[model samples]
Target: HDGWQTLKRFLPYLWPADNAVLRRRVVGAILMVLLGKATTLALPFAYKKAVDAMTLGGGAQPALTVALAFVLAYALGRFSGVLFDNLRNIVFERVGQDATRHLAENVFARLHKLSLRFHLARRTGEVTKVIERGTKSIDTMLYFLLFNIAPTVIELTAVIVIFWLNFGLGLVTATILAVIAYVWTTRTITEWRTHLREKMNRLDGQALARAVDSLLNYETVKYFGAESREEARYASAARAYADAAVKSENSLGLLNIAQALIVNLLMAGAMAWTVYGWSQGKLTVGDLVFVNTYLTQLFRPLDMLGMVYRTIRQGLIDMAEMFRLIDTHIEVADVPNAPALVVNRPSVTFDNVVFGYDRDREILHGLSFEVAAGSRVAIVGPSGAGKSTIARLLFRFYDPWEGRILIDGQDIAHVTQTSLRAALGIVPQDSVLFNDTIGYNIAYGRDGASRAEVDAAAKGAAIADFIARLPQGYDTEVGERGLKLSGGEKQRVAIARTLVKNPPILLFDEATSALDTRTEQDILSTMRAVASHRTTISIAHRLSTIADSDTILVLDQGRLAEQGSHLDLLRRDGLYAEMWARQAAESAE
Candidate 1:
């Protein structure tokens, strides 16, 4: 309701379940607060006691005798607090590190688990930055609240009660009011500064985005001779970013100046009140020393209290956004007690499924079809004909808003998505390879697929000889998304990886250029070899590529326009026949 929903999620880290080892450690942490409190707390009490002793007066002789007694004890008491400060960190470090490590995994799994549309509709680095800041802030906040803030609260209470006891109600009332006024001012001014921080971050994001995009577009800028123009735009963004940072720092300085006035004002007021009583002979020199020492100790920590409060508020903002990501809804979730999809015959069906990425516009409009067991089926259509939507639905990247999609006569929605995906393999237009070794890409297709198994799969897809001939033999780095590899080379790697899976069904949604070249024919022939005896669904670009399929589907916009073999499709003289003639005529040129 307030900011504590994120804090409530943090409770398990503080007081863990079933892990008594660290649960006991948290208790030890809170208990260890005593060492510093006990040591530093004796300073004022001991000093005040010494003042009272000297005031009872031997004038000099007996005073000096007892005065020397506490000198070493005073040194020991105040000095011991230095060592006590770091003990809580040591005690709580285990829980902090453990919780944050696991916290990253929770966010990681959720990002990948969310619908593809959400992933598509987001910025990459911004999401990562949120996670990084959120996790780091959580641990830092734990330390601040537990050690720094808790001690301040304890000290304030002790100081308040001592004031009431020694100085009576009048000064006590003044002291309380001063504290309240100081605290209220700190929060009010600091809260106003929060917008400046957000503004700085906003300008920071824009400036960095421009730098990244400009660097990535260096080739284009060079070709167009836009280097001077690029620099002008980038400098403009960078200047705005610096302007906000300067504005933010100026506001912080204003807060500090205001904080200074309050503390100093209260200090002078208290001294005036005490001296007035001394002048009236109602208070002694010892009382003056006592009051002065306590006030100094009290206001010392409160000096930085505004900074701490500001950080805590920002951390709360960071964590609340991260918690929202954790609570992001899973749109394509498996059912309760959902069983793994087991492929008996590899038959596929689209049971009048209707869907869209955007709810207002349908991408696939009640599209229905069937792929008989072990048959090679082709779906041909123009761009935006929803051909790829069928492949994505078969893979269950999304669930249709209406009707059902089935595999082996079992509704895909009712089965475990992991198992559903495991039973089929998809090789799309451009295979997304990690910036890792070629061996790793294929091995990712199946967990624990042995080195020998990778070698075999590569040979099957005819990429093994190429890997062996390279200087880094299967270890060559594929530049971001495999850019270092040619189109045909990428196809072989994708084919090898899918071959590594060797699932009952293959989904080929790749329909690309390099069409006029022999490489296109070679790649298609290799695909045909892999598709043999496996139930295959091809969303093909070239009619010659899928003309031999047992059945051909013609999609127009979001609906199925025609369905038959390639020859029968031509005989119908519809969309497919016209498309086939035009493509073949272009190819003849």
Candidate 2:
């Protein structure tokens, strides 16, 4: 009851068209049920007549006619059973497919609306698992209910009622005892089966995740000589999973033995009743035949149903838990009735602000700043001193805790993220590229840009020459995350992607930090070339990279340590001056 009550909630998710088909299948199925019971009931009667005819001499022709009629009725009943089964299968397939699609779509849509903090807190593999496991769980639930549980309930009720009418209390008592014994034993044994299934799924996912993560970082994995360790770890997970499955099957053996014993008891009990009736001169050979035939047919549906109920319960539990995950709080949520952005005026100001990833750890505190419209500003600080966090905030990936972020005097918190993001272009330190042709990777996120526009953007970012030099030119596959490209090459592609979008605000998040001196200078030169009239905020690790910017911001533990041009900051000799001095010393060495 707990299991079915849980599963019943997801039934409405079956699409309307699919549900209609299922309804027809269920109707057809009910028809089969009635016809099947009628045919089965007829069997006992026909057998009784045939046996009585054979007992008396010269009753051969009548017996032959009754036997032939029974055979014909049985054959016709079997054909109806086959037809209904085929219909059930066809409709169930459609139902499962539509339900899978709908579930996937709904979960995906919910994920897209989730906040950046929520997504950032979890790994890609975990999110993938949620979607994959949840859908499969739903599939299991649907299959069990439509094909097994509902039909079994209907059959059980029919069997109980018919048995009570024909054989009185003895037959009813015997069946009830058999059902109780089988069900109790099966329930106990299959508990291990459910436990094994869940453990196997966990281990299987862990192994698959490790493999995928390694493949994504295949070069690094090989470079570090961790292949043997990875293989050993995967093998261990596989062994545990295999052992659990074997143990579960062993547990199921207990149920199988119990069911077999109960079936034998049913046959033995029928024989005893027939002997009692014969001694009282109340039994004919027909009554004995009917009792044997009905009892044998009952076992099959009952046995199948016992196993299905347990698996269905497990699947429903998994699906319900998965759906609960998608309902967690969103860290970077949209404001209600938020205003749209105004691209013409691209000024940005961060008032005295406070922020943190979580409550216990504050990343930025009492920070204040301003960036003039169409001006290039650089934020320089030691790693983890809130420079990257500021970039994240400006992009609306997260909001400040204590102060307002303004764009041209309008509070950015009041603006919709979609409208705000449309006006900005971002090129992060490690820009992710899909496994696609170089041209496609560079032209991504631009939406509806022509080939000429894409080529122009590539040329502006200084990556066009390199792309053309490849064996396949623009058609060359970048592989996963542009692993096929060199560090500088990947950086150039990132710059080109941002150029294609050509937004009013450009955020360069450590765009040139990974390159060597010469390559860094070349990429920086291109960035300067194309970033005209755009409000560019560059987060730089190397002070030299942002030396020519209009203003520089030096941060210390989430506070504004100093802010000015390179010359002014050097004169002040604050945190920025010290950083410049250390960098110059490292270069001199």
Candidate 3:
């Protein structure tokens, strides 16, 4: 039923209601299909005449001119078939490509819009390759279905009709039987072989993914003394793939031979029958030649029929999988007619919120917290205290399981997700940069920010001087995913990125890990310098810098252990004061 629904869903892209020119192109291609088939059908009749012309004057002393003319006609017909088919492709290409583009665009857009929940569970490699397979299927599917398989059906019927009229009921029935068995054998063998091919493909994918994974964590492997172990693991994977590949080849061999046996039977029987007819003076030498030539011509397309069938079937399957991805449910969608967040004052309130990445357990257990307007709050706790989950929840990557998060008195779930995110900016603990220039990555947080705006943002984040020192400055490429930059450098770019966006709600989520001492001091200084009208929520374990003023939240084991100003928390002699003392002593050392 889903397959049928996917098929129905595919109709609109195939025939665009918005584009009349595309529809006209479809008609043109079909017209060419008709013309192309006509040319091909003429080949058998023309060859018969050529043979008959040569048999003139008691099988010798032929009318050479007529023979030459028929031979020329046959040659022209063959070339015309190829010409018309190419013309059809040329005319219909835009339609096929447009359909491919529209479908690919929708899937690409949908993938980006899907909630992080869906993304966290699926592999990027699997999804991308599936999209690749489906995108290419549109053109190939249209090609074989319309031109190859459809043309073969018409040719098959026409050949049977010719046999019935010229030869007898005997040849017509015999030809039909061979075709019936040929199709059955083709499908049976193809289906069985398809399983082998799919397994082969699966093993190939495993081998490739393992190599990628191993190389990605090669440092860890080296530390663990696993180079030879890794090689041995990959060797087993390659062996499985090779075995699957060999089985597929054997299956193909079986199919080709089976097809040969059936078609050769059709050929030998037709020739023997025609020879008997010619000996009885019921048919001419030309009849024998026509029967042989026509079947041979028909068999050429028929030989490719198995592959056409396989490709089209596989194409449909790949397309159905893509459609399924397009239909993946978005977990955190904006409510209907939801208003954008109106920032009279930037304040975030989490009201007794409970949530988790899993259903059976939760990370934030009924945690109630708030950062008032224009205030800086530090949320610190032991690791796995849902510190990062707090950041994710506020940003609406995942909504609370049972409670409301509010921004400026508006329930975030009731606000448009886009506008809510637009109001907030984050300088993440670990930042990922695009494989673009430093200026582009800095300005990436918001579009339409001018060069001056980019320069000012980098200046604010203390990264402008570093960029100027680089040979190409902002024009320098970050290489693959910011690998060219050190951890400290990438964070500076990320801070500049968020500054360019200029959101009112600023989140500094564990901002200083893996950074050198000078970079950390510079970054920490830069953050406090700009903590103004932006209500800042800082998730951190370090307590010394944020101890001077505002609120300090102490979370212990996903529960709010204590909350107050730094001096007030120290007065209580609780976990917060103990942690602060420990941090102070460590700094002294």
Candidate 4:
């Protein structure tokens, strides 16, 4: 019932009304399960009839005829049972697959909807493992619940009634007690095994996480020559998992042994009593045969009782963990009836913005600035001067604590995130790409973009010549995080991707920070060539890069230190002047 509690919530997906055909198939499957049990129960009766025909003092022809009829009937019953079981599985295959697809799709979509903060905090390997286990558990849980557990209960109820009719209340009472003992013993042992299994699962996750982390950071491991170190860490987690697994497996054998003892003892006692009746002429040879046949049928499902209980219990655990992830609150949700952002002038204004990653330590303090439409503005700051925070805020990745950010005089907080992001383009400091083809990565800028558009964007970013030189050209694979490409190449790819979007506003967050002097200059020339007339905000570490901007703001410790033109700031002998002179000295050296 507890297992059903989780299952019931997802039942609608398995039995949706749009699929009237599938609904009928599901009903057919249930009927098949019931019919399968009925045929299975009839097999023992056929065997008993055959035995009675031979044992009684019937004529040779009559006995042979009866025997032949019952033998063929027995064979037919067995075949029918197998046939219906297969038909049940075939009819329900669509339901299981549909349910799995829908649940997996919902979870994946929700993961993307979650805040970046959640992703940064969660372990990728562990999260993926949980999903894999949870999805797999659904099919297994459904199978056992329908095929094994449900039919077993039906067969057991039928057996109890048969026992009462054949041998009165005494035999029925004995049969019930035997089942109770078998179930209680199996459940108790299986529960202990479940705890062990849970432990093994946790350690298995840790081992997998370690392996994934180590492999993803292959260069880092080789850089430190820490291959053996990673191996030892993985081995440690694996060993713990293996130990738990061994304990769980050993307990399984113990369970099977105890189960055999209990079920067989009941069988031997019931058969012995039936034999005593036959000797006293109170029971026929058929009755003795019937008892054995019924008990044997009962034991078949009872043998799987421990396995059924364990599978369902483990499935519940896995499902609970996945449900927890699904239940996580989305921190940055769109307000009800939020309007799409409408960009008219393409101007951006941060009005007294205040915020931080934490409440205890504020990172930005009442910072305010505005970039007029089609004008280029640059923000120069030290490492913790909140330069990147400005880009994040402009993108609405986070809301400011104490003020509003406006584009075309409309508050960003009131607009839909999708429309707001669509209106702006960003080429971040560190250009991370998907592990995909160069063309695919470029085309990601605009969904469903043509191959020609992708090529043109690459040319605008000045990376077309280099791509053409490669054997694979645009089809060349850029490895994970674009590690196969140089820093400048990755930056160009980012620029091209942004160019493909061609938004009214662009934010360049130190886009050329990692390039060599010559490459940086060339990229900067290419950037200016393409980004002309856009309302641009360039957050720069290199002062010379932003020298020709229409306006410049120097930031320090979350506040604006100075604001001016290139020549005016140099003449002011202020924070901007000092920084420019210092960078100039470094460049000269």
Candidate 5:
């Protein structure tokens, strides 16, 4: 029951009834295991009969015939055990592969469904390692639990019964005690070794994370000239891991020494007792051979018992970590039976919204605003005024703590997240591109988009000319995060990506913040041409860029300080005016 309970959840995948043919294969595999063990146990009988035939018989011809027959049978019995074991492995290979594949796919899918917060809190290296180890462990866990360990247990039980029927209670009692001691010592030492192994794994994970993090921020490391420092950190972690591994390996030596001592002692004592019985004419010479053969057979698997225990324990730990990731609750899931957002004449509204990344520190305090349908609206604010938070809230990355956000009289929270996101597109200030072809990156905006559509979007974003000048054109690889492209070029690619989406509403969070003045003006010109009909909301730090918007909302410390046309705000001489004057001064400099 304990074995069934531990493996119960994985049983469906291992023995999937949906595939009757495969289920029959699994049953055949199990039958092969029983047959293999039976053959293996029967080998010792052939050995005993062969020895007795030569020792007790009078006629040389008759004895030779009997002896040769059993000798041949004994060799065939060993071969049959090997043949059945291999057959079992062959039959069950697909079952192991299917179960492993199903578990890995489910975990991978769940990871993508998890919220941004969970990903941000976890290291990519560590998370990937957990998944890799977990998936790999499934095959090993299944094989050991079902075949290696199960057969070993069956063989052990069979050996006990065979010994009990032939010998007295003294032999049985002695055999059981030696087994108990061997198993107890192995388990206790293996547990300690497991702790060491776990510590080493943790250090390895941390070292990998450090390496990945440093490589991802390759430019940052060069700018600060911290290559040696990074190396030293990695070395320190590696050294700790090496030390733990040495101790773990040494402990295995200790476990082996103890196991060998127990098993050899039991063998010597059992054989000596049988030999004494034979000398007193109370037992046959064959009985002595039988006792030796059975003990040797039992000790074969027992020798590997320590390793099996350690592997199974470590595998469980890896699986537990992966299941933790799978069990992580999704923070921003759509409501059950939620309807898709209808976006005819889309109008955006932030109605008295309050939010915070952390509950103790609120970022937006009851912020209220609106952008009319097909109108250009710009939000101008200083740093920490919750500019990007508005973009995140619009995308429903996090729900507002108070009040509601709506698009076209429908609460964004009440609608399906997929449909809501589908109707809105954004060009973020920092454009993070995949390490892939330029064309592939652009095509990500719209699923099943044609090459011509991608080119058209690039032209609309004023990036087509630059792409054409490149040697590889659209096929060029954009290095990690588009590092191969300049600041202005990356922004243009971002714009092109959004243009390809062609959503009803567009959100630009300082889309040209990284571009020079001339490139900024050029991108802005393209943006106006492309988004002339869509409802557009731009969050701006540089006031001049949003001067042509239909409306400007100036925010200070999460509250709406002023709202009007750029010219109207300039006339009011308030927060917008002050910000404009400072920017104008900087531009002159």
Candidate 6:
């Protein structure tokens, strides 16, 4: 029942009894818990019998018999408890893993449906942390609720009930008050600790975010001589985290001291009562034995209660924060039973769209545009304009705050992000490659793609020759974030990955910007080959790269400033003209 509640609360978790293998595993676990609980309940009785035999001054033979019986029962009970614990851990572990996998899958399914502004509002590290913490919190939660609180409560209740039936109600009443007082005080201490922990977590996240930012832009940091600045920011955050941790530890220490004091007092009181009854002849040695045995057993859980409450409190707090993310609305989601979006010659369109990240601040204000099937279009603008936002919306990075985007004249909102994106490819501004092999990175989107197919895509992106030249060829390990590769190499790997996916609509957000002039041209040639028969949208910063594009869109502060062929835009003497004139002047120098 304890595990059932834990599993049920997370709806995505399922017990796959439908599978024969899993069903056998589940049954074995259930038996383990039952055997363990029964053993736990049997231990007190054995201890009581041995104590009574000793107190009554029994003959050596009888005393030996009782001692031996106690030892055997203790062993059985101890083994069963161990078995139950192992089984419970196995069950909860399976549940936690399933939850983690489902959560990641769910987020990936909706990732494309999120908007550009949404991505802008959060750091990449912050979003990654959300996924990490959210999954990790489930295991932490299971440890608190299943292994800690639930077992403690069950054991305590069983002990209390036995004490009442055997030794009247006074000791039972005392035990209940002690348990309640201990739990209440523990909760109060832990509530304060929780606030401190949250503050610590906030600081920790900020420190981590800063470190990631500095590492990703190490060149910029070194160039600007801002290592000290970054270090100071990280140090401040680290200090806050350390202070919060110290205070929490101190508070837990005080709570433990208080709990131990109260439990000892209760123990002494129960012993005194048992001795009085023994002296008055109102209770036999047997009853006195039971009282002593039960009191010690009961206090064990009370001692554990203090720690369990602290752990469970932290678990619930972390859960409340993480689950809040599950509520984010998906914009470019599937139609109810939406069919696959397969475009023979993919073209993209934007209708009269009024869109914004927030209603009070519009990014795309009644924007309209079109790209011919299998034609390349370039969108150029200053930072913060809606240029990148357009590509993100078209790819369903986020659903539009308002307005509609169409691909092949089909409303994107009506199609699932999975099906829509399965046929569309994107190379984001950041080279977000995973820590994996060169081959694995390139073949990420193309499941079951052969070495030949991956090799062809790599060659097409002009990365195959370099990968083959490495000691391990395509099998060489890429360190975390592909840090093992040079900037140009990582970008080529990304391009190869997109090519492997073979999606019809290719969207590039400053794809070639990371490469040097020499590598840039090679990558551009590869991109041109890939974009030859597909719909391509490029948010270009270099005007020369888009010179051969069918249309150039110039946006100024989220509104269209000019739209035409590259030469035609220059002739109009608008935003495009000004940008070109600036570039021309920089080149002349």
Question: By the TM-score metric, which is better: model 3 or model 6?
Answer: 3
Alpha-carbon deviation at 11 in model 3, angstroms: 1.9
Ranking by TM-score: 4, 5, 3, 2, 1, 6
Off by over 4 Å in 2: 1-5, 15-66, 188-257, 275-284, 304-310, 481-483, 571-574
TM-score of 1: 0.81
Model 2: per-residue lDDT, tens digit, 1-589?
2556554656566534455666665466556545545554455555666566666536475756766676565566556655666666664576587767776887788788888766677887888887787778678767766676666666677678877775668888888888888777777667766777788788778777877776788888889999998888778877777887777677677667878888889888877888688778787666777677777766776655545765676676666765666466566666788778776678888898888988899989878877888889888899868688877888777788899888887877888888878788888888677888888877785778678878998888887778778888888877775437678888878888888888888888888777799988777778888777788889888998889999887888888877888899889887787888899999999
**Residue 491 displacement in candidate 2 (angstroms):** 1.3
- Tell me the whole-model lDDT of each prediction, alpha carbons only: 0.80, 0.76, 0.83, 0.84, 0.85, 0.73
Assess the local accuracy of residue 202 in candidate 4 as a C-alpha lDDT between 0 and 100: 88
lDDT of 3 by residue, 353-402 (tens): 88888988778886777778888888888776767788888888988888
* TM-score for candidate 2, residues paired by index: 0.81
Report the candidate with higher lDDT, 1 versus 6.
1
Measured with C-alpha atoms, the lDDT of residue 121 in candidate 1 is: 85
Model 1 spans > 4 angstroms off: 4-6, 50-69, 121-126, 181-289, 305-309, 363-368, 481-483, 511-516, 557-560, 567-574
Per-candidate TM vs. native? Answer: 0.81, 0.81, 0.83, 0.86, 0.83, 0.70
* Candidate 3's TM-score: 0.83
lDDT of 5 by residue, 1-589 (tens): 1344446666776777798977898899999999999999999899898998899876565987899999999999999999999999998888788878888888889998888888788887888888888878767877887888889889888888887787788998898999899888988888887888898888888878888998899898999999999899888877887887888899889988998899999989998999999899988899987887787778767656777766788777766676666678898888899998998879888899999888999988857877889888888788868677889889999999998999998999999988998999998888888999889988989898888889998888778898889888888888675438888888888888888888989898878777788988877788788767888888877888888889988787778878889789889887677888899999999
The RMSD of every model to the true structure, in order and in angstroms, is 5.9, 7.0, 6.0, 6.2, 6.6, 8.0
Q: What is the Å distance of residue 281 in model 3 from its true position?
A: 4.3
Top model by TM-score, which number?
4
| Candidate order, lDDT descending | 5, 4, 3, 1, 2, 6
Q: Could you give candidate 4's per-residue lDDT for residues 96-208 as a string of tens digits? A: 87877788888888888888788778888888888998889877987777778888889999999878786868789889999998888988888888788888898889889
Give per-residue lDDT, candidate 5, residue 318: 67
Candidate 4 off by > 4 Å: 1-5, 54-64, 184-257, 481-483, 587-589
Angstrom error at residue 393, model 5: 0.8
Clashes of each: 0, 1, 0, 0, 0, 6
